Design a protein around this nucleic acid. Structure first.
Ligand SMILES: [Mn+2]
Ligand SMILES: [Mn+2]
Ligand SMILES: [Mn+2]
Ligand SMILES: [Mn+2]
Lengths: 103, 78, 96, 95, 94, 105, 95, 87
DNA sequence: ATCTTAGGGTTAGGGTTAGGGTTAGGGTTAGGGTTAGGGTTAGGGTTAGGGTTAGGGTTAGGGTTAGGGTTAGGGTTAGGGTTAGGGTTAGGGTTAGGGTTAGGGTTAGGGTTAGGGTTAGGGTTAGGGTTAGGGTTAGGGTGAT
DNA sequence: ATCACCCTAACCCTAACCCTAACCCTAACCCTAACCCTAACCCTAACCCTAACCCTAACCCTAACCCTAACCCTAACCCTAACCCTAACCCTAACCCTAACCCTAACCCTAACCCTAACCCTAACCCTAACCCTAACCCTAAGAT
């Protein structure tokens, strides 16, 4: 498989097919699906990492959408990247304004 | 049915947003703003359904309409 | 008997630290079908499509409440008013 | 019925690498699938434009490269451009 | 040298129809050219997606029309969908 | 009529639009009536803009429409403003508007 | 000697009713080359590219002033303060 | 043929009167004294974000000259679509 | 409330820059021949929707109480408006020069074209861990002596 | 603070249901293959951007008086918060009906591709009219008498 040739879990062959099928350009380079599957695999791992940590904190083993939201909004970069995105069943980060605290 | 979105249901959504005091005029203004949002999303969702020559508005049509509106939704098979 | 603005602070934590929906599924499904009928008649809605719409709405409104609250606090207040929702949606590029 | 494609096989594999003593909800897997699809399109579409702007008819890893630099935030882009050039380099070596 | 494409010939033709005495700045023609190009790719790209969503390999006037209904505002879309269906109808006859 | 634009009653280039649709990577194939429909939608919108702009130029005693006239036409229409809401017309300036509380008592 | 307000209100009309740029072309061109230098050295700028950047900047800042002013008026004021620019940017999604 | 003069502190070139003019177009009557620095901060951020992407386009095109198109493509990426300089 | 005074709005024709009319020319759109694959009919499987029954009990809703936030109004500094003048560099049209983009010529390898081969992953089934749900508990502040 | 008051998190109980481990076969990816052209290389042109000279009066900056918007306390008012208990209605739990979606089978016709073709339209050139600029021109309304 091309994924094993590149040291990847993400499907290099599938990404290459989606690039020509999706009407992005006339031709698709040999290393473009390899580079892309790796960038997608990196980002999924970067998310899964912080999400498993949030699941660990909440005494759970299985990451639910709340853990994904907590991981995203607690990062600065993942939040900026997914700034105009809504995680269904994610809820909000717990934050109460300082002026709305007891006197 | 816009009154089905009750004053206590609106108050819960204000609490999640970190709202301490909620004016009485708010409960009506929220109903207005929610109706506008729903109209704009469903209108595009239906335009997708109608283009697909279907009578059933699918989860994908609602997803495509949300993305068009810039309120991209994750988790609905998009 | 709790002081004015103490059950409110307990409620905020109760809901922020939760993810369940805050509008009942049936009144919402009625509103969705009413609005859709005003665009096209003889319409069916996938169970999932309605939930996709409900999630979208609440997430929007909560985010709108966040900005609204920031506007009330900007004008030395603690209570959200229509003038705040209007300033939030105006600067958000929803209103002129 | 029809065939439903998914990145679940790979989201599972990658989860097992970072947290082997951690699992994933059916809803959370849908959120992860939506994330992969969104970012796929974001990068692919940006590379499609670069290819076009420079009168070229091919999306190469150089187009993916600059799309990542444009779309991903500061450090995330640094590490993605790294892991990407890495995987390409390794792929060229092994035929 | 290289040749530079433009919609200036047509922006001029259309200007004379509407205001036969009114003229146009070189900068204003640039703004009009940017407008035509922006709206071209807004509609084309939306039609490209509609075809993809419905597993269709072709962009037909049916995809252009729903893209117009999605992108333009209420009364502008109505008149554009009108003006468009008319030109297509006329084209099919001749 | 030998050009496709003349067959459709258009000024906008039906042949050029058809070429840009294929040459722009939007889909595998381009329908016969899609460039016709599109050139007409673009021609309609340009005429709708040019109309309101010529009016703003005539109000300003000018013969020629400059980018200020285009901006004035866009921002004064409700739909054109919504359509070009997140767009900047270079050399367009702003609509003259002063908030009521900033006015002399 | 005009009262405090009379020259400000005259200036607002003078500029709103006009389209010329409000930052001098040379100080702005230095700022652009300084900033660009700090991303990549040995950079040339097309005369037009700089004007494209200047137009973009002023149009942005004027629009930012519009929202900022609406924030000062919201808190019963007439003068724009940093807390207003910050709230206008917070709500605009710039943070 | 031999040297480029050092570019330094040009954010002050965006003077207090130049900032005043931009406030007038936005319909601003009173302008705080702290504003002139806050505006300089915000303008610098805007310019960094636009030029950064413009240069990423220039670098992709294998060029040393940042064109008007690169600045246009960068502005469109930022959602501040500019009319008039091509495209 | 009358009266001077400095503002833009205006007119003038000076007078320059620019747009639009104009030429010829270079490339693109149109023509009409062949081509095949998307799409469009057809029937007809079947999934998934809405319909309409039911039993609480969760939740919505009116109307009790005072709490303290919003608001008003007046008084307090002091902050940013406005004036002037002397610099102070921005802006004007210069001038040359070569780093830089790039026509346009030539060749090659990258990529698509085909298919038939294995092999990965969709679609299902199912047993069993993780979450769920209900209770009593320690834990930690809430409101008031 | 010091006192009772609530409540929500903390543990440990046992149950519902969905992860995720499982199998099987489908369809997708992969290694045979010729085959065409896009991109790479190399050139030079040729613009165009950079920096170089020149002068200047536009425009900035710096401090001066003080006009007045900002923000302080306080006091009046009622807006909405908390608390309650009657009661509507949302919620699973459950069933069938069959309209709507879509499988995939035949077959037509649309959109592709091709070369020569003429016709638009790019560009390079040229004059004259729009508009730009600075001369006074009265009108107007700012803001002290
Ligand atoms: Mn530097
Ligand atoms: Mn001061
Ligand atoms: Mn040279
Ligand atoms: Mn045909």
């Amino acid at each position: 498989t091309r994924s094993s040739r590149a040291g990847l879990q993400f499907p290099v062959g599938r990404v290459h097919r989606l690039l020509r099928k999706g009407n992005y350009s006339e031709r698709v380079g040999a290393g473009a699906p390899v580079y892309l599957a790796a960038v997608l695999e990196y980002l999924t791992a970067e998310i899964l990492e912080l999400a498993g940590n949030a699941a660990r904190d909440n005494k759970k083993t299985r990451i639910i959408p709340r853990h994904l939201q907590l991981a995203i909004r607690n990062d600065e970069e993942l939040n900026k990247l997914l700034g105009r995105v809504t995680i269904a069943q994610g809820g909000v980060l717990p934050n109460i304004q300082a002026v709305l605290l007891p006197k | 049915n816009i009154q089905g979105i009750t004053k206590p249901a609106i108050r819960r959504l204000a609490r999640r947003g970190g709202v301490k005091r909620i004016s009485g005029l708010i409960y009506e203004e929220t109903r207005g703003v929610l109706k506008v949002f729903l109209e704009n999303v469903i209108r595009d969702a239906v335009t997708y359904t109608e283009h697909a020559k279907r009578k059933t508005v699918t989860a994908m049509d609602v997803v495509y309409a949300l993305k068009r509106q810039g309120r991209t939704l994750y988790g609905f098979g998009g | 008997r709790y002081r004015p603005g103490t059950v409110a602070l307990r409620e905020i934590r109760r809901y922020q630290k939760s993810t369940e929906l805050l509008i009942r599924k049936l009144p919402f499904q009625r509103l969705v079908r009413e609005i859709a009928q005003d665009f096209k008649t003889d319409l069916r809605f996938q169970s999932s499509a309605v939930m996709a719409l409900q999630e979208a709405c609440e997430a929007y409104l909560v985010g709108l409440f966040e900005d609204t609250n920031l506007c009330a606090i900007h004008a030395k207040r603690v209570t959200i008013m229509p003038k705040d929702i209007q300033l939030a949606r105006r600067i958000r590029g929803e209103r002129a | 019925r029809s065939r439903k494609e998914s990145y679940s096989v790979y989201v599972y594999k990658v989860l097992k690498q970072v947290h082997p003593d951690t699992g994933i909800s059916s809803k959370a897997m849908g959120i992860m699938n939506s994330f992969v699809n969104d970012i796929f399109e974001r990068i692919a579409g940006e590379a499609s434009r670069l290819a076009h702007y420079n009168k070229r008819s091919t999306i190469t890893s150089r187009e993916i490269q600059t799309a990542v630099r444009l779309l991903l935030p500061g450090e995330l882009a640094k590490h993605a451009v790294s892991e990407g050039t890495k995987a390409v380099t390794k792929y060229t070596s092994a035929k």
